[PDB]
Paper text:
In plants, DNA methylation occurs in CG, CHG, and CHH contexts (where H = A, T, or C), with the maintenance of CG methylation mediated by the DNA methyltransferase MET1. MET1 possesses replication foci target sequence (RFTS) 1–2, acidic-linker, bromo adjacent homology (BAH) 1–2 and methyltransferase (MTase) domains, whereas DNMT1 possesses PCNA-binding, RFTS, CXXC, autoinhibitory linker, BAH1-2 and MTase domains. Of note, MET1 has two RFTS domains and lacks the CXXC domain. Arabidopsis thaliana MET1 exhibits a plant-specific structural feature in the autoinhibition state, and a conserved activation state compared to mammalian DNMT1.
Cryo-EM map of apo-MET1full was reconstructed at 3.21 Å resolution; the RFTS1 domain (aa: 1–345), the acidic-linker (aa: 648–707), loops in the BAH2 domain (aa: 926–934 and 958–965) and the catalytic loop in the MTase domain were completely disordered reflecting a highly flexible state. The domain assembly of the core region of apo-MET1full, BAH1–BAH2–MTase, was identical to that of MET1MTase bound to the hemimethylated DNA complex with an RMSD of 0.550 Å over 776 aligned Cα atoms. The structure of apo-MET1full revealed that the RFTS2 domain contacted the TRD in the MTase domain and residues 601–610 in the connecting linker (aa: 599–623) between the RFTS2 domain and the Activating Helix, contributing to the stable spatial position of the RFTS2 domain (e left). This spatial positioning of the RFTS2 domain caused a severe steric clash with hemimethylated DNA, in which residues 360–366 and 397–405 of the N-lobe in the RFTS2 domain played a potential inhibitory role in DNA-binding when compared to the DNA bound form of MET1. Intriguingly, the connecting linker was rigidly positioned across the axis of the DNA duplex bound to the catalytic core, suggesting that the connecting linker reinforces the autoinhibitory state of apo-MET1full. In the structure of apo-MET1full, the DNA Recognition Helix (aa:1208–1231) in the MTase domain was kinked at Met1219, resulting in disorder of the subsequent catalytic loop, in which the Toggle Pocket composed of Ile1220, Phe1235, Phe1246, Thr1251, and Leu1254 of the MTase domain accepted side chain of Val1215 of the DNA Recognition Helix. The Activating Helix of apo-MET1full formed a three-turn helical conformation, which differed from the turn conformation following the two-turn helix of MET1MTase bound to the DNA complex. In clear contrast, the RFTS2 domain of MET1 was positioned in an upside-down orientation and the N-lobe of the RFTS2 domain was associated with the TRD in the MTase domain away from the DNA binding pocket. Asp402, Asp420, and Asn422 of the N-lobe in the RFTS2 domain formed hydrogen bonds with Arg1393, Lys1412, and Val1420 of TRD, respectively, resulting in spatially different position from that of the RFTS domain in DNMT1.
Author numbering: 346 to 379, 386 to 440, 454 to 515, 526 to 569, 574 to 647, 708 to 748, 751 to 925, 935 to 957, ...
Amino acid sequence: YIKINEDEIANDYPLPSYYKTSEEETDELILYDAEHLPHRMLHNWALYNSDLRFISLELLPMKQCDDIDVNIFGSGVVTDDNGSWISLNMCIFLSQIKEWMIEFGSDDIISISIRTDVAWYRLGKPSKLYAPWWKPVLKTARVGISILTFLFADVTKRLSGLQANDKAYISSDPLAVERYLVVHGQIILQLFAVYVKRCPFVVGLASKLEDRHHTKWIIKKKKISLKELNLNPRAGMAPVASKRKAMQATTTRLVNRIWGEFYSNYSPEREIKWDGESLGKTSAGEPLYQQALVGGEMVAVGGAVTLEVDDEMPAIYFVEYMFESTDHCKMLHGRFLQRGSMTVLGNAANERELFLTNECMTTQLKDIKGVASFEIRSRPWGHQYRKKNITADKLDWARALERKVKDLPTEYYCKSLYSPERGGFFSLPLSDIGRSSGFCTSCKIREDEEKRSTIKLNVSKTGFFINGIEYSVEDFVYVNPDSIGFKSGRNIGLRAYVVCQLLEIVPKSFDVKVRRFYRPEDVSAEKAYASDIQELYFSQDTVVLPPGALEGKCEVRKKSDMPLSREYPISDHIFFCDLFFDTSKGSLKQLPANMKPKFSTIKKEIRLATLDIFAGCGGLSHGLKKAGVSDAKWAIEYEEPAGQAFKQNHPESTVFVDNCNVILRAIMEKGGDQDDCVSTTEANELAAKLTEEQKSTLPLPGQVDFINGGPPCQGFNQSSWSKVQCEMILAFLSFADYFRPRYFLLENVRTFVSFNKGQTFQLTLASLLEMGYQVRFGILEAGAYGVSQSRKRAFIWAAAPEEVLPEWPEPMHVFGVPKLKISLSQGLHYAAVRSTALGAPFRPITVRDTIGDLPSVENGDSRTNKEYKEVAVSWFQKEIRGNTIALTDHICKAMNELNLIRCKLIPTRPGADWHDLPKRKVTLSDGRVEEMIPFCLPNTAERHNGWKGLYGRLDWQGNFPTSVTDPQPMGKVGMCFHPEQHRILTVRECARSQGFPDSYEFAGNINHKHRQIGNAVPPPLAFALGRKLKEALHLK
Ligand SMILES: [Zn+2]
């Protein structure tokens, strides 16, 4: 017997996918424990190997065989045989199928059947997931019947002559079609043999199969004897059974109105005389005028005028001041009033809403096309003003509709200042605009920015200014490392800022001489490992640089004067120097006292009551509480293990382990607002079934001052209203609207600003602006703030009109990722923070700095309590271990014997992955011969090839990849193995990768703990945001 394995057939079949199902699954031998076998047939069947990888039916033999090297299992629904035959166009799991059969469809109705060791199985319509592995079998059957209708090289020429119109077309190339025929040989040879029996085509095909021999087998006779247990991978596993029903979200009448209106309107449903007297004179001695006539209509400071434009739509300018030119000219100054449609909002903005901008313009009075009605909205803020705002909104909308019906001029309103450079909508400086004093604040800002572009040397000849930063003699500066003169291995060759001491300014328009400081990583990687992050080595290397190669200023002190407080995400540009590094010998020595280097010399209750929606294990809440800005008094979490973990880590919190929509409905029912609720009847029934004690502790408007959390947006095409109605972002925005918190921090994945052609982001911004918020957005990479796991997160800050929008934390660690840009419109882009790829104050955190001291554990552990065996060595271990003396959650997911063998066979070299496993039939101590190489990708499809990272180890000096949120030791494992040990990353190691302190505790199964760790904002990034918010909170 001759068989062809996956190497040749892999071209036609798609990329290998894996089988998943629900908990409904029963054994097969127990149903029928015991040629003349039961003929039970199958619905929604599927086939797989021992790794639950979908496998073509072509890999099973035709006759009896004593030993079948390839093991194959199946699943489906066992049902009564009805003699269903195919011509064109309770759940069970099978045992090791021993063969398969084509039944001769004399009336062109050929069927499909399989034989396990117990009973026959006729095959019906398969599962939709297995259809890609099902269609090629039908295609080759159609080819076989086409040749049968026709009746070796003559046949190949005949079938190559056919074009793509016929269903039995393969390819016009003789060689490719011959390869296709020889690859699917037995599937045609047996079909021809069951009809001609000794036709030359048959013997030619057999000869070709021998020419492409890949596996021999022995044909035998009746050997049925039940001597197997089940050996099925599916047997014994408990599948995930949640698939929570996406019920319609509970929303307020405002958010629902906005989203429904958007998805229903779109988606697949002259005399120029003055007026008055001058109130003063400008600096240039020009008259200052407040009011003027234009073509019979009015123009005044604080109003808006229109400028004639070439087509398109006229531009609107907010008048700042009016003056008469020296040559008796009527001229005015205005600020650009961007229309809502041209901002990042796009089509999700009202027609009547305009946004102030920093761009200014100056023009003659006679160039005005006309004056448009324009008012500034200053509605009061607070939860108690929501009903009045709703009534005013309805009245204004009715008035606008009435005016549009009678084709009257549109009345505009402005309530936000759109700054794309800062990337957000801010509050209007009502006391700084429309001053009519002849001074434009935006013009002053532009002039100041222009002044921040010149390399000017001060009169003292001992310093200069660059980028608005003053440099002086004896200061400490940053120099780009270049200016001096694998997936895991991202930060493998990136150097931090070169710290230098600027000694003398030598003119050349001048160059600066700087003495060099040497970082620990310059000596060796091991020295950088066992040393502080903020340590510098003194040296006597002086280099001359242009003044444009200086990035900032820092401080350098001794060990005695270093600050006592040590926050983990370091926001202080402070280093300490104690040792001397000699480049000639590379030897570190003590600092001699002969020179005595001139080092740097020293010379409330704002905590906000917090409601944390979708809290999870509490990473964001812990980070914000460590920064002294959040209380985490209330939390809401659907998942039971996540709520348990939150209650474990935050005992003082009040955790609601319930649906967000149900909790919102209960809150809005307690407050007395039922007519403002858009909720399903199921939500009403669930909310009505709540303990009175729980309803007594529910939050109410006025008791919440900070709402934070990340909604689980499904995203992923322009979905209709009936599909976007069930998203949790609507419930989150309804929470924000009803409670009216002073601050609102939304967190989501990087692709949040691109879901549904970016409509979700625009709609979120539109809802937040309709509420009356100041909204800013950005994308932050957690890897640049201390963690060793790259994670890009989109953050949206929202603040009350009278509050201050927090700034974005400055990245302080090197990370090789370009600027993270959000595209607004008109080719404009916004970057939240600078890309610390070519330079940063501190070196990147490596894997060894994170998991280099934890005790070793074998593959699969359950001991949740252990003791440390090695003292903390690096800076990260010392900082994250703290005073903890009991190691918790140091357990790893247990892999089967085959996966353990595969992991042990992976070499402990950087960049190693599944490409390094040897090709050999392995045999674990179970009687199950298996292929060692996990995947068999097609030779073609280069883009769909190069599957690097799967079964991949971690580089010691690399960083944790993004693909370790939920390690899965069944199919596509990914880059999750340990750098040195033969195991998957433990829960504690994954927590340390995200910056979770060793004192943090997780709850639930290992899968639940990993899901909590992967779904939480890193406590480092959360703490950085918290301290930025604390800085913003002290201004007000
Ligand atoms: Zn201006």
